[PDB]
């Protein structure tokens, strides 16, 4: 019974480049919670078309 197949993929992982050398900490990006409620300062969005 004739069939047909396709396989696909890769190898990898994201590497952090910089590290501190005196202590071994990392500081390049950080997050923050600045606004408690700010959805009121935003226009509404149209809904999804479930056809």
């Amino acid at each position: 019974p004739p069939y047909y197949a396709i396989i696909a993929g890769f190898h990898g992982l994201p590497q952090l480049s910089g590290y501190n050398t005196e202590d071994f900490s990392f500081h390049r990006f950080k997050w923050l919670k600045y606004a408690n409620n700010v959805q009121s300062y935003l226009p509404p969005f149209p809904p999804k078309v479930e056809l």
Binding site: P1, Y3, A5, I7
Partner: protein
């Protein structure tokens, strides 16, 4: 409301993919007569993809005719021979292509026609040893030839 009627949905057609099997494991299929007593048009209703375990009559007047396996009768449980992956039209063919050795997910094995699709049927898992389906992952494994 009276002289002008607005838009209104008439039709709705949805279309799915097929039931995926493993490439690495293999396929083996042998075509069988369909048992005319069971209502086959119920088993091929919905557009969702499914697959269902099939047991063969060992003997009797309909020896060779295959029917969907009932999970209540042990003489229908022991003689299971395979599972129809794709789907079929009994209004044009009494001879379905039963697959004997394949590897189908748990999501796409529905032994009842009114059981909800895309959801694992539980009575197949609670009869996994009698039906000789080994579960190792999501994907089932069965070789009824050996």
């Amino acid at each position: 409301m009276d002289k002008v009627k607005l838009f209104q949905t008439i039709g709705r057609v949805e279309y799915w993919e097929r039931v995926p099997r493993l490439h690495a494991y293999g396929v083996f299929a042998l075509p069988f007569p369909m048992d005319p007593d069971v209502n086959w048009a119920q088993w091929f209703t919905g557009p969702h993809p499914r697959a269902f375990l099939v047991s063969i009559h060992k003997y009797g007047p309909k020896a060779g005719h295959v029917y969907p396996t009932n999970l209540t009768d042990e003489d229908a449980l022991l003689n299971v021979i395979g599972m129809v992956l794709d789907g079929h039209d009994y209004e044009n063919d009494p001879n379905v292509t039963v697959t004997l050795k394949a590897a189908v997910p748990i999501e796409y094995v529905q032994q009842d026609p009114q059981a909800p699709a895309l959801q694992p049927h539980q009575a197949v898992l609670d009869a996994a040893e009698v039906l000789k389906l080994k579960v190792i992952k999501g994907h089932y494994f069965f070789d009824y030839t050996r």
